[PDB]
Every structure is written in C-alpha cells, then in structure tokens.
C-alpha cells in the first residue's frame, strides 16, 4: 500500500536551490526573494538597503498604489533621500555566502 | 455529480491506486471485451466512383503516387475501384 525510496530536498537539493532553501530556514533572504518592509524613513530611521558593493539602485514607490516608480543609485555613506518624496535610505554594504 | 461512490476523506496515492485498479482498468477491460467481439470484417460496399472521394489533385509523394499512406486493399478502393 506504501514504502519509500524518493529523495527529499534536504537530502538532494544542491547549488543555489539549496542555498535559498537553507537561508529561508533561518529566515534570511540573501537572494532577494522577498520585498523589504519600509521604516518610517526619517533621517533618524532611514530605510536600510543591504548591498554587496558600494552602491545599489533603489526604486521608491512614494505612495501606495503610485504607478510611477522613482529610481536612483544609493551610494555608501550618508543617507540619501528619494528625489520625489524625500524618504531616507542608507546603504548597508557587504559580503554574502561566507 | 459526486459519481455514486463516496470516500473524499482524502485523495492520496492509496485512493488514486484504488481508482486505477478498481474503476479505470476494469472499464478498459470491459471496453476491450465489447470491442474485440464487435470486431470481425464487415462486408465491403459496392464501389461507386464518386467525385468527392478518392481525391487526387497531385500524386502522393510515395509508392506509385496513387495509394494512400495506410492503404488497405480490402477496404480502400483506388479512384478506378478496388484492387485486383
């Protein structure tokens, strides 16, 4: 009626599929599968933008449902503000898979 | 329809095998029966060179150009009638 013999992802998943699986398990998202949640985005509480280098593109949707997305390179250093709405973003660089 | 049986507790592998061997394959056995029983050569009809049938606007790209790909001499007449 039953019996086994089929591998599981735990046993057999490899390469990037396994990396994504093992990160999900720890609740981390190094391959950017999820949407980040906004902070209040003030100068004291900037949105924090992980990157592996010293600049990353940010798209800001200034208000919920805006169809227009505002795009700009976010550089390592002091917080920058969206050119449309002023919300603050600060880059937090570096590293990944040990 | 529900069909006329019951189960729905869960449609797992055991349930689908139960259907495979208890409904699906038994149907196939029945219809194999019924077919191979209404089989046996029905007697062929008078050839009539109807112009809407046995079309030949170009020779076929095989054999002598005038035989269909799965030609059966018993039941497929040529435009000029059944083969000798």
């Amino acid at each position: 009626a039953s019996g086994g013999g089929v591998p599981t992802d735990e046993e057999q998943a490899t390469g990037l599929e396994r990396e994504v699986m093992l990160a999900a398990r720890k609740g981390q998202d190094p391959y950017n599968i999820l949407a980040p949640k906004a902070t209040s985005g003030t100068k004291e509480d900037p949105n924090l933008v992980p990157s592996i280098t010293n600049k990353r593109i940010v798209g800001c949707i200034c208000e919920e449902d805006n169809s227009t997305v505002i795009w700009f390179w976010l550089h390592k250093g002091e917080a920058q503000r969206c050119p449309s709405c002023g919300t603050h973003y600060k880059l937090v660089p570096h590293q990944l898979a040990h | 329809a529900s069909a006329a049986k019951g189960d729905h507790g869960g449609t797992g592998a055991r349930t689908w095998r139960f259907l495979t061997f208890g409904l699906a394959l038994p149907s196939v056995a029945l219809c194999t029966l019924n077919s191979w029983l209404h089989s046996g050569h029905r007697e062929r009809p008078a050839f009539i060179p109807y112009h809407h049938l046995r079309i030949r606007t170009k020779p076929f790209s095989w054999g002598d150009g005038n035989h269909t790909f799965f030609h059966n001499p018993r039941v497929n007449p040529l435009p000029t009638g059944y083969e000798k």
Binding site: - | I48, P49, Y50, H51, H52
Partner: protein
C-alpha cells in the same frame, strides 16, 4: 396553371447572399418529381416550376456536371 414566369421569386427558405442551396434544392425537386411522374406513368408537366426555378438560378456548368453524374450513377444527392 398559374404562369407568367419572369424569374425565380424570392424564396424565404433561402433569404441570404449565398444562393447555392436554392439552386441545389430546385434541381433536386425537379428531378425527384420527374422520377415520381415518369415512374407513376403520370405527367412531367407538373414538375415545371422546379425546372424553371433551377434553370434560372443554376450555373450551366453545375447543371451539366450534375446531369453527367446522374447518368454516370455518381450523383451524391438522393433522387
């Protein structure tokens, strides 16, 4: 028996632009009728309306092909 024929009148069975079935149906009616008469030793003259209607409507080459196929025994409609 009610004549003065100019051409085939409008027929509400075939009210659209494609008139192929009108020509075909009157050809069939004529020959069915003429089978019935000729056989029943009756008289072909009652079949005349259909002859008039199909001669008006049917391309000559179609009447002529269907006539050859009747003689040949390969006409596909039932008469």
């Amino acid at each position: 028996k009610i004549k003065n024929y100019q051409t085939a009148p409008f027929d509400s069975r075939f009210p659209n632009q494609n008139q192929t079935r009108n020509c075909w149906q009157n050809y069939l009616d004529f020959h069915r009728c003429e089978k019935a008469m000729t056989a029943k030793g009756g008289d072909v003259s009652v079949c005349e309306w259909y002859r008039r209607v199909y001669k008006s409507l049917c391309p000559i080459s179609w009447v002529s092909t269907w006539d050859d196929r009747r003689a040949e025994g390969t006409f596909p409609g039932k008469i």
